[PDB]
Design a protein around this ligand. Structure first.
Ligand code: IA9
Length: 305
């Protein structure tokens, strides 16, 4: 339809400090969350039912990501490591050591034989999942790296940084293939490829989201009306029903825009602190949102379209 009708269905409480990231498993069954409380929690994606806690990091966790088969998780921590987890057993399979400071972001490639990470140390690292060895260290940026993401076939990596740049990397060679810069270079707080891999969605700490044609190297859409000047807030493409852009905001709301018209179609009220993370379910019209220290809860919202 014209607008979605997301309504609050479940509030997931359990973390005792700020929640940093929420991610749906590719198979749609689970939600994983990470927190400053050093814990990963697993929850039912459709019922919000608490499943289990996964522990081991020595400091707070900034991000979590699923393998393509929904069996593994990778986490990125202030303790300067990433950990690879077998979700079913809760086992830490590997600890990925190499970054010299806080690890902020992580992702598996589609094949899930590789992990990419970004750190406060200004590097992007590519890791082998099976051995846990660092395969490449990319001298990616001149300030902390806020996000890293593989494209649809894993041949490219996009990275964003407080240095105001988005960079595109060849996975195989580690070569920088593109540096994206618009009219200014405010800190880039988030970036990801579109599902089809033709565009990149990037957030900057000037209350702006932008859709880029990275190949042409041109900004196609701009999304505004939300508050984002301090925190690295995750954004998403919603594609299960109407085509939306979804993001958290520092006014405690989840914002939803029409991708094409750039109009705000919904604002979701409920959280009591900054909404730092949102996720969109892979097959159903379900959004997960998570908030910082004064809230500590995760919310599941559902729409008919
Ligand atoms: C709750 C919590 C932690 F326990 C640890 C780190 C963070 C955090 O702010 N991570 C972060 C830091 C920077 N930075 O200072 O350059 C940039 C990006 C992130 N994040 C926020 C969480 N997003 C899922 C991943 C990237 C957060 Cl929110």
């Amino acid at each position: 339809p014209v607008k979605p009708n997301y309504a609050l269905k479940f509030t997931l409480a359990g973390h005792t400090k700020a929640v940093s990231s929420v991610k749906f498993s590719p198979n749609g069954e689970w939600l994983a969350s990470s927190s400053a409380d050093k814990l990963i929690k697993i929850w039912g994606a459709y019922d919000g039912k608490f499943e289990k806690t996964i522990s081991g990091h020595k400091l707070g966790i900034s991000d979590v990501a699923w393998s393509s088969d929904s069996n593994l998780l990778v986490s990125a921590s202030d303790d300067k490591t990433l950990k690879i987890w077998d979700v079913s057993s809760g086992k830490c399979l590997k600890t990925l050591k190499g970054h010299s400071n806080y690890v902020f972001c992580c992702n598996f490639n589609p094949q899930s034989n590789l992990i990419v990470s970004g750190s406060f140390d200004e590097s992007v690292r590519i890791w082998d999942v099976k051995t846990g060895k660092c395969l490449k260290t990319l001298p990616a940026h001149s300030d902390p790296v806020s996000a890293v993401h593989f494209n649809r076939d894993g041949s490219l990596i996009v990275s964003s940084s407080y240095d105001g740049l988005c960079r595109i990397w060849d996975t195989a060679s580690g070569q920088c293939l593109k540096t994206l810069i618009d009219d200014d270079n405010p800190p880039v707080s988030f970036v990801k490829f579109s599902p089809n891999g033709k565009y990149i969605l990037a957030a900057t700490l000037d209350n702006t989201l932008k859709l880029w044609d990275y190949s042409k190297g041109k900004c196609l859409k701009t999304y505004t009306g939300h508050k984002n000047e301090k925190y690295c807030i995750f954004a998403n493409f919603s594609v299960t029903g109407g085509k939306w852009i979804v993001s958290g905001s520092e006014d405690n709301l989840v914002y939803i825009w029409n991708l094409q018209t750039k109009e705000i179609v919904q604002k979701l009220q409920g959280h009591t602190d900054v909404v730092i993370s949102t996720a969109c379910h892979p097959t159903e019209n379900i959004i997960a949102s998570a908030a910082l220290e004064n809230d500590k809860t995760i919310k599941l919202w559902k729409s008919d379209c």
